[PDB]
Amino acid sequence: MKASRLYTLVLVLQPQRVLLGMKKRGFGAGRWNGFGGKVQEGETIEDGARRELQEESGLTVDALHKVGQIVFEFVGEPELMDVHVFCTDSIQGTPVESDEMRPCWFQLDQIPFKDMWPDDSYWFPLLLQKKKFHGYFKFQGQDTILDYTLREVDTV
Ligand SMILES: Nc1[nH]c(=O)nc2c1ncn2[C@H]1C[C@H](O)[C@@H](COP(=O)(O)OP(=O)(O)OP(=O)(O)O)O1
Ligand SMILES: [Mn+2]
Ligand SMILES: [Mn+2]
Ligand SMILES: [Mn+2]
Secondary structure, eight states: OOOOEEEEEEEEEEEEEEEEEOOSSSTTTTTTEOOOOOHHHHHHHHHHHHHHHHHOOOOOOOOOOEEEEEEEEEETTTSSSEEEEEESOOOOSSSEEEESSEEEETTTTTTGGGGGGGHHHHHHHHHTTOOEEEEEEEEETTEEEEEEEEEEEOOO
C-alpha cells in the first residue's frame, strides 16, 4: 500500500466559460490547469482550495462545491497525489496573474484539452455535465497514461 498527499483543484465554471491557469513554473508547467496545490496543516480541504484559488488567481470566494476526487500515481514515485476537485458557487472579482499561474477564460466550445493534463480529457466532460466522479490515473512521466479508472458517483 502507498501513502497519499492531499491536493486541491478548483474550476471556476460559469454557464459559457471556464477559468484556467497557465502553469508558469513547477509541477505541470506549460499546461492549462485548474487552480490548486497542497493542503496545509490546520485547514480543511475546502478551505485549502479557497486559499489556493486566491493565491493563484486572485479570486476570493466564500464557498466551493465538491465535484470529484482523482488519485494520481507516477512511475518511480511512491507517494500518490490525492486531488480533491471543486467548482465555484459564485465569484465577485477579476482574475489576476500570480507567480504560479496566468489565468485566462476559455469558452466551453474551446476547452484547450491538447494543452491540459491528458487525464482532463476524461474527467472534465463529467464536470461540464455536472456529474460527480472518482478517478485514478497512473502516469509514466507527464504524457503517458498506463492505467486509469473513472466512475460516476452520487457522493464524492
Ligand atoms: N494529472 C493531473 N491533472 C490535473 O488536471 N491536475 C493535476 C494533475 N496532477 C497534478 N495536478 C494539479 C493538482 C494541484 O492543483 C497541482 C499540483 O500542486 P502544486 O505543485 O501546484 O501545489 P502548490 O501550488 O502548493 O505548489 P507550490 O506553489 O510550488 O508550493 O497540480
Ligand atoms: Mn499554489
Ligand atoms: Mn499550485
Ligand atoms: Mn501551496
